[PDB]
Amino acid sequence: TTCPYSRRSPAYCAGTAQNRTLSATYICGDSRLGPVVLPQFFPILDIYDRFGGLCPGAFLEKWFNQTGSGWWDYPPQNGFSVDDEGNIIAANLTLQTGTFVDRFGSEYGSFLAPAAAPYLQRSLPPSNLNGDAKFPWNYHVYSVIKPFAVLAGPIAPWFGQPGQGVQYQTYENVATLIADGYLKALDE
């Protein structure tokens, strides 16, 4: 599956914002499609396309709004892989002390990932690559100082990404896990 528009085609940005002022910053001058120059990504990877092979317009048509939300349509069941009988592939897993986990988001949320898993494995939409700082303000890395249990399981493919990394849903939010002496942030 690939976009029929060529590399020399002017119609590649069909059905997008088509904002001349931003077109050097965001793909098609459309912030939802992410930046023209990708920052960090945590050879064969060429098999994967930022839009899963669709064209920008077709990408937005498949994944954005669709319901009335005015934002992305997220996968079912917090994005865990769903087995052939309709149940998430996930169970309570105890994180050993010294484990590195990270979160793309502020300490309010309850989701973590194995540290430095690749962006493409998290099945995040492309608007989240919109970053100028080396490392985003909300990106955090932690070590497990004190064992605790999470709902752990594979990440379903979504938003044209292959997914199939692993994610941890915590039972307290990250701020609380820091406060109670489970997660210790680290700096550079």
Ligand X SMILES: *[C@@H]1O[C@H](CO)[C@@H](O[C@@H]2O[C@H](CO)[C@@H](O)[C@H](O)[C@H]2NC(C)=O)[C@H](O)[C@H]1NC(C)=O
Tell me the C-alpha distance between 39 and 27, whole Å: 14
Determine the interface stretch with ligand NAG among 65-73, 104-112, 122-130, 172-180 (rule: CB under 6 A): 65-73
Q: Which residues are catalytic?
A: 103, 167
3-state secondary structure 82-151: ECCCCCECCEEEEECCCCEEEEECCCCCCEEEECCCCHHHHCCCHHHHCCCCCCCCCEEEEEECCCEEEE
Distance of CA 13 to the CA centre of its chain: 23
**Greatest CA span in the chain, whole angstroms?**
56
Strand pairing report for 166-169 and 139-144 = unpaired
By CB under 6 A, tell whether 22 contacts ligand X.
yes
Beta carbons of 82 and 154 less than 8 angstroms apart: no
* Residue that the structure tokens 């990250």 belong to: 174
Q: How far is the CB of 21 from ligand X (least distance, A)?
A: 4
Interface pick for ligand X out of 1, 2, 6, 21 (rule CB under 6 A): 21
- From 2-10, 12-20, 27-35, 108-116, span contacting a second copy (CB under 8 A): 108-116
148 annotated to bind ligand: no
Pick from 5, 48, 74, 104: which binds a second copy (CB under 8 A)?
A: 48
* Interacting positions 87-126 with ligand NAG (CB under 6 A): 91-92
- The dihedral built from the CA positions of residue 173, 174, 175 and 178, taken in this order, carries a sign that is positive
Task: Decide: is 31 part of the binding site for ligand X (CB under 6 A).
Answer: no
In the bound state with a second copy, the residue whose beta carbon lies nearer, of 18 and 131, is: 131
Q: How many angstroms separate the first and last alpha carbons of the chain?
A: 40
8 in a labelled binding site:
no
- Residue 171 binding ligand NAG, by CB under 6 A: yes
Residues in contact with a second copy by CB under 8 A are: 1, 40, 42-45, 47-48, 81, 83-85, 87, 89-94, 96, 98-100, 102, 114-118, 121, 141, 149, 152-154, 157, 162-166, 186
Residues in contact with ligand NAG by CB under 6 A are: 65, 68, 70, 91-92, 149, 171
